[PDB]
Amino acid sequence: RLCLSDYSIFSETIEICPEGHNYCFKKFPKGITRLPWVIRGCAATCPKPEAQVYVDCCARDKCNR
Amino acid sequence: RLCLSDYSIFSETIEICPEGHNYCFKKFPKGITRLPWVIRGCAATCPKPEAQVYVDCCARDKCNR
């Protein structure tokens, strides 16, 4: 499985997932619009979210944008 | 298309991409901070990544920094 590490304009950073990891996730904060941190990577299971955080979880190549 | 071959301070090494190659890429390892190798060049398609490697893939002149 291939996930994105970063995504912008069209600049995407691509990684190949470890064995058994077939999910791509994206983590971002809930009340931030003024240039928020965003976290991406591979996962064996959809990451559980934290207090003020959403996690996108998807299962296709380079899906977490 | 023009891609970077090397980039630093402000010293950039510039190349002109072959016909049909309109992507610039950048390849770098995943757990290395202590002066890592970095690979840059032109591409017809975004290079697939390797085990412990990220590949940036972008589509503008001299975009892979």
Author numbering:
A (entry chain A), B (entry chain A): 1 to 65
Task: Copy the relevant paper text.
Ringhalexin exhibited a mixed-type inhibition to FX activation by the extrinsic tenase complex and also exhibited a weak, irreversible, neurotoxicity on chick biventer cervicis muscle (CBCM) preparations. Ringhalexin, like other 3FTxs, has three β-stranded loops extending from a central core containing four conserved disulfide bonds which resembles the three outstretched fingers of a hand.
The model was refined to a final R value of 0.22 (Rfree = 0.27). The first β-sheet consists of two anti-parallel β-strands, β1 (Leu2-Tyr7) and β2 (Ser11-Ile16), while the second contains four anti-parallel strands, β3 (Tyr23-Pro29), β4 (Ile39-Ala43), β5 (Cys46-Ala51) and β6 (Val53-Cys58). The three fingers of ringhalexin consist of the secondary structures β1Ωβ2, β3Ωβ4 and β5Ωβ6. The electrostatic surface representation shows that the molecule is predominantly positively charged with few negative patches in the surface. This flexibility suggests the possible role of loop II residues in the function of ringhalexin.
